[PDB]
């Protein structure tokens, strides 16, 4: 009746880390694809009456991983499991959370679609790390846990950056005001703001060190322009701390010929191959937070 | 089979205005209360096969108006109406859209509860003006229209404030960066930022005019502090433009003994009685936007 | 995993009585109101895995208490509670259980609306005392316990009224034939009947003591006229025993200038303030019945 | 897109009458049984886009007719029908509307089960004549039309009984007080009451004509004893008017050796064979009421 | 909290056998019929918190047994049982699993209707023996266990037929190729095929013994024709092994005047009365399979 | 209010054919992918009140196309469309329609998962061509049309194969008995059967022409072995007619080095690139059948 932990095809390293921190090991599931690109999920062990926990990040090929997660949840549910919990470090389609505004002709809400699919597959609980919009919690009818990576970010700032008592935290866009502001309050220091459309700046950032904080980085269209503007303004050096490092498209190329002292990300998305092609990127372990959340859910 | 428009106990003036702009008149419904404070809804005319439209703002006593709206929707649905649309100028419980963060011990999500109540009552469409969080659109499975009052705000700024070409727009909090930023871009001028915890300010605001823009004002705990900070900083005069003016609690007392040149709001919440006790308050009609949205929904 | 009992803003005394009879104490919940008349519910203790019981009577301001109950149930459900049970001593909107007849134009069914609201909020069980219509049990898909206060009424009749062996039991209306008939059968005594539209009487009621039995009294529009008719017919004195004493509107004034020897009610609705302004009113404790029902549900 | 009327195996005569009053004819459906007592439903004509009406009374073998109705509704729904309406003159399992009281060990609520069956089969509207409990309207989430046969009963009383101005109306049980009372009020005449457990009577019934009114008669366990008590009390003759005459079990034998001047019923249940073995039974047509209800639903 | 086993009106013998194999006895339930052919279900013992198991075969009068099963499940669910499991040895309406093809005018899918009825009644698990179509598992959203009687068929073939090493297995129709083929592979011997429309045969079946295997036999319209064709072809003797022996309509008459050496069936449908009028029929116990499935579901 | 036809990324040619046969043209939708492999759906025109028809085959990368279809349906539904119909020429995950048998450990039912996802996305109708299992019709609660390509197969056999009056139709497996048998009856000729586990044959196929008929061919693991066995048995030439030609994995390599003079398939899956690398493959247009089905659904 105790925890049975399962892992998907994507991001095996974090799954192994979370299993180790729980003093367990991943269950026997073979997730391959048939000849015509159809997902094949075969659970080897018994899940009857167990508290199944599935960890599947929204990275790599998003649709294939999402389909694998749904099929795994359905298979566990039909196999008479007590309660199936889906742990999603990076929620897929989390940037499509609104019907947008004037101009976006009949755009859908893909986040609610994913929520409905997870609910109809048979999920009983959702664990997510640093959702793009905290209001996505309301997209479900089951409990949702929105974990935060801010304590790790503060710890990294304190330990690594020696001048953290006289720095500033800068938001690369207008919507990152809340996160940047909360971090600045936590470190007991001031902050600035940057907006595009071009680049505008409101803050001191003169002969001091600035840290760019954002939730994610897909193509680094942001953060890079913010670093350029900050360097033009008078900043001595610029750091970049991120929660979900996608680094898709050009990305790595842009960081490589950039003046970032360090680009900091977390385990939520595999960074192994990305770190090889870029020395700036550094990784922060968050497996402890997910493991503690899993324990809190399980014991009760 | 054409539009049948109904009005609630709250905000009769806006309902009459919307009816006039539609070249119609409100249906015959008597909404009183029984002896033991229970809602009594009696629809006098036939709604069979009609496109029923109900306008009920979340103002005054929130719970009583919400229950009246739900009972009216249920009565219209059981009476074999073709499609029932709920027009809510101010969405109740819109500030409770998250499970908050560390410290808020097991707080609920009241916005999703209201969404579920409206869905189970029998609503087929929702029309809302300037939702507190745009992601509340995903709280429903029926279509939701999130109207914007920004064009009226811009028009008022242009017509009334003569120095609008050399002003700035200031957000009283960190979460208002997006709205203020969009308004600044539309007016082709710059912007500033104010954060509490005390007040901190990043911007020029020296010997010029600043306009405070926020989504709503419950007790004017904000906006007033921002005006004080701006006046201390060097602003010649401070304006305040708002979408939903609750003006609850002390409110009117605070604006009265304040240095606001004008506090601008919209129809969405009845401002009749409030305007009598405060000369600063001015109202912007938004009935045309709701009427146009209703026409767009109906015609198809 | 044992019982966690919660109480609402209305009827604190009955909640404390039920808690005492269960050898427990009410959980730590702070239920206040925000500035704009919106309910604030904050659960202080952990409800994860607990079998939560919420007691919220439909008295006072009905809509406000109902919204309080719904928000509390939703908060308990989202907080990973094992099972949430709503104990409602007086079911709100219980008199609106039909679509009425010819004349009531498009009247709704508010009882089914409340049932759907409780079902969608997350309630797993319902405990009610003396429902207005027993068929309201079918308004839910979850189990519903319809308790009966008849044993307490019989005990009061036996102990207090010394001539209970040669009395009669009179129904103030046509719909109360079943309750009056069952009480008369259980007491092994005869009965009468009264119908309005004016007053008509079929029974003996000549130089004997008559007892009026009804389910509830909102304004005492009934019962008072029944006592007048009984006194006109020849009854020496008239008693009145009720389950749910609303005593709204004039009520207390009518009883005060009436010839009731005693007006007997039960705990279900707070009678503290009402009893002060009227000496005739007497209260029968029903906390033991609710406590026993709660124990029966919990143990299993 | 106009009315397409269908008929079940039970009660072909009433279906043909309703079709004639609508100036239409029943659709081509062959409803036979396979070898192993399984219902076979084959719709011969096209129902795509039509507003189908199905008439299936709960008479004869109840389960077989109910399954026929459900299969027919499902077949019409899957065949892309616009809206399917189930016209049930006598609602099956209408006497099982409560979980009863102390003594009935874990009895079910079959009426809600039938309601759920009809809702899940695909019914969009329900038309019923004189439901046993009017609160069964709340057992559905679709609109329910509860027709009344009282005008026909009153017309029969006026036309046939010549002394209707100086009669009385008697309820054979305690639960029939409302119907008897309303009929007495509408006829501007007084009333009496009878309760079992044995027979007790409260009323005049001395050298006058008494009429027994009930909703239904299954075995005539009631009504017969009421007539015996009335004859003992002094009634010159006793009439009996009923809405749904089941006349199951002994029934016909009991009426045959009884002193009823006439036993009046309505069409809702086939009375052809029953009337042959008993001269007292007379039938009142109700096809016009159902036809008018169907027209009212269809036109809109 | 352990197993509470209930039995329906049909097939008492199999229920008693399954109870004996589980070392238990059937619960106290009285399932009779009211006067007007309505099902009466009264559960005598407590099912609160128990794992209720109901065995009800789709035999005899199908509709009455199905309604009894649904009412029993609903009664057990409303009585606060932990989990209700429906054990259906023969799934009713299992041959209506498709909307057929060109010619069948708007036929329904009765199997999905039965599935929806069982789901809405409150069933949490389904156990079925040898479904007509294995895809009926997808007709439910709850887990469904499709047991197989093939091991018993193979054992009977080995024990009774001494020449089973040099026989063939023949399918009476085209749709039985899979079952016959699997049996042939398991017995390490060859197979043949027979198709109607008349009879056509592809196989050796010359001066040897053939066994006809099908899923069921309603009227023995098949199997008898296959035996005639096989005997004409050169088969020395013909056997017939079946899972669900309905033997409805003529049936027994056809087997009696046939050249079958033995017609083998299983318990799933009561064969007691049928076996008396036909010496060829033999029965294979399958109570152990159902008992083992029940134990597997319960233990977990 | 008339037909608005939309097309997905996969199978543009068939969509254009169906649009041409309907005398219309495909709507303006841009279906691309964001940087991080997330589907981007933007509808350019208005679908309010329209009867949207979306054609999306389950070919190529299955998961991406399925996600595109779901997002398109959701976008059309939220945009206030009258009715959204999904036309799926090849149903994805149609081979996973059972929970298999002993040996497949806790395998899921992916077809029911896809059905649930389509139902929850907002689909109102499903049109599919030659489903793998006809019972998948019961996997939905909305109407499902299972079109058949058999008339085209018969026409091709008649026109192209000149010796079709003295041929045989052979099933490459045991489960294809029904299709092969129906085709043989339609052409008024005989048939044979082939089963693996190795290869076994029952039929004449001696100096005559044989045609292999199956529903689909993924890797041609079947059909090729059947052709080898048929050639070894004595067949002069062997043909192969298929409905859904996947031709994944090796496929083309197997057909090219085989003795097939014709491998006949239909449009449902794009055959353009496949036909270039193999001269044997030939294509049959089925756009007329889909267009006629669409018309039949639309007009009604
Ligand atoms: N995976 C993705 N990659 C790139 N753009 C995306 C992706 N998903 C959504 N988008 C687009 O990005 C926009 C969201 O931008 P964002 O900065 O979050 O808006 P906001 O200013 O409201 O925060 C949406 O309009 C959506 O069309
Ligand atoms: N009607 C109300 N009046 C006052 N406070 C409210 C009301 N509804 C919710 N709140 C509280 O106010 C907070 C919302 O503050 P807000 O500034 O919108 O948060 P955020 O910083 O996420 O924007 C919530 O935590 C909630 O507890
Ligand atoms: N809280 C209330 N106060 C006063 N009247 C009410 C209340 N709720 C419902 N009603 C009205 O009272 C009527 C029910 O009266 P009642 O005597 O119970 O009906 P019945 O005659 O069927 O018993 C309904 O028609 C409804 O309109
Ligand atoms: N078809 C039927 N035939 C006989 N008795 C029934 C039938 N259906 C239900 N019953 C029983 O009759 C009782 C209902 O009797 P009724 O007099 O209507 O109750 P009440 O006294 O509440 O009016 C129920 O307890 C039920 O067990
Ligand atoms: N209880 C029944 N008795 C006789 N025939 C039935 C019964 N239920 C369904 N049928 C009919 O029998 C047909 C099923 O025949 P079957 O041989 O199973 O079809 P298939 O060729 O698809 O296997 C269905 O078309 C249905 O109309
Ligand atoms: N896309 C696919 N490619 C290859 N194999 C599959 C695919 N989808 C399902 N399967 C497997 O193929 C099996 C179905 O084989 P099939 O011949 O249809 O079985 P049956 O003999 O019941 O018809 C399933 O057990 C499933 O595990
Ligand atoms: O793709 P790039 O520009 O790196 O980042 C996309 C941005 O879009 C927003 O949702 C996030 O805040 C993120 O910063
Ligand atoms: O109550 P006061 O301080 O006036 O305003 C409450 C604030 O809380 C936020 O949700 C809104 O942005 C609003 O400005
Ligand atoms: O409001 P008053 O006249 O006191 O009482 C209302 C009556 O209406 C009925 O539902 C109850 O039986 C109650 O007696
Ligand atoms: O079965 P019999 O005694 O004829 O009648 C049953 C009675 O039970 C009540 O629900 C009805 O009012 C009906 O009169
Ligand atoms: O009624 P008879 O011909 O005996 O059998 C009916 C047949 O129809 C099919 O579903 C079964 O395979 C069964 O063999
Ligand atoms: O992948 P190959 O062997 O070509 O074909 C797979 C087979 O599996 C069955 O569902 C179909 O009948 C098909 O013939
Ligand atoms: Mg009353
Ligand atoms: Mg009665």
mmCIF file of C-alpha atoms in Angstrom, chain E residues 97-101 109 112 133-135 137-141 144-145 148 174 177-178 181-182 185 191 193 195 197 200 202, chain F residues 97-101 109 112 116 133-135 137-141 144-145 148 174 177 181 185 191 193 195-197 200 202:
data_model
loop_
_atom_site.group_PDB
_atom_site.id
_atom_site.type_symbol
_atom_site.label_atom_id
_atom_site.label_comp_id
_atom_site.label_asym_id
_atom_site.label_seq_id
_atom_site.Cartn_x
_atom_site.Cartn_y
_atom_site.Cartn_z
ATOM 1 C CA UNK E 97 -22.411 -4.197 -29.626
ATOM 2 C CA UNK E 98 -22.427 -2.463 -33.037
ATOM 3 C CA UNK E 99 -24.683 -0.192 -35.060
ATOM 4 C CA UNK E 100 -24.594 -3.069 -37.599
ATOM 5 C CA UNK E 101 -24.262 -2.310 -41.324
ATOM 6 C CA UNK E 109 -26.181 -0.236 -29.129
ATOM 7 C CA UNK E 112 -23.335 0.459 -24.151
ATOM 8 C CA UNK E 133 -16.989 -9.164 -27.807
ATOM 9 C CA UNK E 134 -13.828 -8.490 -25.810
ATOM 10 C CA UNK E 135 -14.105 -4.838 -26.850
ATOM 11 C CA UNK E 137 -14.357 -3.867 -21.860
ATOM 12 C CA UNK E 138 -14.062 -0.418 -23.425
ATOM 13 C CA UNK E 139 -17.778 0.213 -22.960
ATOM 14 C CA UNK E 140 -17.080 0.989 -19.275
ATOM 15 C CA UNK E 141 -14.888 3.489 -17.464
ATOM 16 C CA UNK E 144 -13.714 -4.883 -16.263
ATOM 17 C CA UNK E 145 -12.422 -8.446 -15.906
ATOM 18 C CA UNK E 148 -12.061 -17.176 -19.966
ATOM 19 C CA UNK E 174 -16.972 -17.195 -39.668
ATOM 20 C CA UNK E 177 -12.154 -18.542 -36.161
ATOM 21 C CA UNK E 178 -10.180 -16.970 -33.306
ATOM 22 C CA UNK E 181 -7.892 -21.493 -33.712
ATOM 23 C CA UNK E 182 -6.629 -20.795 -30.189
ATOM 24 C CA UNK E 185 -3.060 -24.354 -31.052
ATOM 25 C CA UNK E 191 -8.864 -27.062 -37.392
ATOM 26 C CA UNK E 193 -14.141 -23.769 -40.872
ATOM 27 C CA UNK E 195 -19.809 -20.727 -43.176
ATOM 28 C CA UNK E 197 -25.117 -18.691 -47.081
ATOM 29 C CA UNK E 200 -19.655 -24.218 -47.112
ATOM 30 C CA UNK E 202 -12.989 -25.849 -45.749
ATOM 31 C CA UNK F 97 -9.053 -1.955 -28.030
ATOM 32 C CA UNK F 98 -8.837 -4.715 -25.390
ATOM 33 C CA UNK F 99 -7.007 -5.388 -22.142
ATOM 34 C CA UNK F 100 -5.551 -8.386 -24.048
ATOM 35 C CA UNK F 101 -5.240 -11.762 -22.293
ATOM 36 C CA UNK F 109 -7.024 0.526 -23.629
ATOM 37 C CA UNK F 112 -11.016 4.367 -25.176
ATOM 38 C CA UNK F 116 -12.534 10.145 -24.031
ATOM 39 C CA UNK F 133 -13.013 -3.132 -34.461
ATOM 40 C CA UNK F 134 -16.608 -2.147 -35.197
ATOM 41 C CA UNK F 135 -17.220 -2.226 -31.442
ATOM 42 C CA UNK F 137 -18.484 2.654 -32.014
ATOM 43 C CA UNK F 138 -19.482 1.931 -28.419
ATOM 44 C CA UNK F 139 -16.378 3.664 -27.075
ATOM 45 C CA UNK F 140 -18.136 7.021 -27.634
ATOM 46 C CA UNK F 141 -21.351 8.580 -26.388
ATOM 47 C CA UNK F 144 -20.104 7.449 -34.798
ATOM 48 C CA UNK F 145 -20.189 6.576 -38.502
ATOM 49 C CA UNK F 148 -16.827 0.821 -45.426
ATOM 50 C CA UNK F 174 -7.702 -15.847 -38.261
ATOM 51 C CA UNK F 177 -12.484 -14.383 -41.659
ATOM 52 C CA UNK F 181 -16.109 -14.197 -46.198
ATOM 53 C CA UNK F 185 -20.165 -13.861 -50.859
ATOM 54 C CA UNK F 191 -12.617 -18.587 -50.044
ATOM 55 C CA UNK F 193 -8.086 -19.342 -44.650
ATOM 56 C CA UNK F 195 -3.248 -19.002 -39.798
ATOM 57 C CA UNK F 196 0.250 -18.614 -38.350
ATOM 58 C CA UNK F 197 1.928 -20.516 -35.484
ATOM 59 C CA UNK F 200 -1.166 -23.345 -41.991
ATOM 60 C CA UNK F 202 -7.191 -24.622 -45.389
#
